[PDB]
Structure formats: C-alpha cells, structure tokens
Amino acid sequence: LDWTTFRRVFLIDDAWRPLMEPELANPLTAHLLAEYNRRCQTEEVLPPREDVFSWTRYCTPDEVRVVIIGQDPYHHPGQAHGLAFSVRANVPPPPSLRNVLAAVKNCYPEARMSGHGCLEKWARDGVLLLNTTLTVKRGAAASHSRIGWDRFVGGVIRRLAARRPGLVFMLWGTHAQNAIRPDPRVHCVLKFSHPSPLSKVPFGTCQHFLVANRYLETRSISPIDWSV
C-alpha cells in the first residue's frame, strides 16, 4: 500500500494518482521524502504538511487549462498554503502577487477584483499554480531548493503535458524558463520576465492573460474569467 499511504500522509486527491504514482517508485523519490521528513524533525517547515499538496485538491488533471510555474513557497508563517503565489484571504498581497493582480486588471478592465490575494477560484478553474520546490525552511528563501522536489514536480508536469496537448504555460523569469521547456509546437508557451517589481520590465505590462484566452478560443477551449 504505497500510493494509499502516500496519499493519506499528504491528503492528495485521487484524481492525480495516474500522474504521481509512477514517480513514487523512482529510488530518487525515496531520498526526497526521507530528506523532507528529516527537515521537519529539525526545523519549522512551511507550508504545513496537509497543505503541501493542496494544488491536487482544487481541480483534476483533466480540468487543467493553464500552468503557472513558481520557485518556492512564501517563507513567513501564515502566507503559503500550497498554491504558487496565493496567500490566504486576509493576508495582504506580497510584491510579486500585487504585480500579477495589476496585470490582470490592465488586461481585463471589467474583471471583478476582490482585492484579496487568495487564488483558490483560479485553481478550481483549472489554473495550476505550481512551485517547482514545494517546501521551505521558515525565514530562508530557497533553503529546500536542492532536496529534490524539482525533479518530482518536473515528472508530474511531463506526464500532465503528454496527457493533454494544447496547454498554456506561463513562464515568468529566468528560473521558470530554465526549469520547464514544453514543446512550443504542441503547447502555447508564454514567456515574460519575473513579476517582482525588481525586474527591469514592469510586470503590469504583461499581456499573457489575454493571449492565453485567445489561444484557448482557437482550440475551442472555454476561456478563463481572471477575476479574483
């Protein structure tokens, strides 16, 4: 009972079994899991274990329309909850997220913006918010970036993409563009500089949300209501 036990520890939705189960058997995965559990014995690891795989709960692989890649979770208590960039409902949006929400409103002036930074609505809509590193030590950015999450997540993404042609990938920044390299003839690959205001080009000028919806329409795929 490997999948059964793994799924129970992380409360993973069963719909993701075909994409994740094959990764469990890889010997490299065992090293990853043991290291993650070792870190939890020696430090404050975020987000909480029950939230690490929260991204599997909002939508099934077949509902995925857009994939947005991130680096690692927010590292202060209360911010991260398993979705890249999203913060729980009453936490003020951090700098990069603030720029993302700005670009959405610039693209869709009619979008019903709530003012919060919780992206669960997007997730249920098939917008997969995926960090390549799923955990972080409290207060230390990129601290868990070399423990092996990237190859596991990388394996799930390859499987998903091969399962469903015509996905839209939004790759913002140097890390995202080097981590994930989907076939641009089979999928819509959109690249931009990082959303942080420290980037040389203001992220508020990014048109990705509009361009993604035009691509979906050409494939007869229902476009996304980016209001959040």
Contact residues: ligand URA, CB under 6 A: 70-71, 73-74, 84-85, 96, 131
| Of residues 79 and 213, the one with the C-beta less far from ligand URA | 79
Helix 95-107 and helix 208-218: axis angle, to 10°?
50
3-state secondary structure of 182: coil
Please pick, among 51, 72, 125, 150, the residue that the annotation labels catalytic: 72
CB of residue 208 to ligand URA, shortest distance in Å: 16
Nearer to ligand URA, 96 or 99 (CB): 96
Q: Residue 211 CB, nearest distance to ligand URA (Å)?
A: 21
Q: Reply yes or no on whether 183 is catalytic.
A: no
The residue number whose beta carbon is nearest to ligand URA equals: 70
- In this structure, what token pair is assigned to residue 83? 């979705």
C-beta of 82 vs 213, nearer to ligand URA: 82
Closest to ligand URA by CB, 61 or 73 = 73
For residues 105 and 138, give the distance between their C-alpha atoms in angstroms, rounded to a whole number: 32
DSSP summary character for residue 152: H
Polymer length in residues for the chain: 228
**CB of residue 203 vs ligand URA: minimum separation in angstroms?**
13
Q: Smallest gap, in angstroms, from Cβ of residue 62 to ligand URA? A: 24
- Residues 189/67, Cβ–Cβ less than 8 Å: no
Any idea which residues carry the catalytic annotation?
A: 72
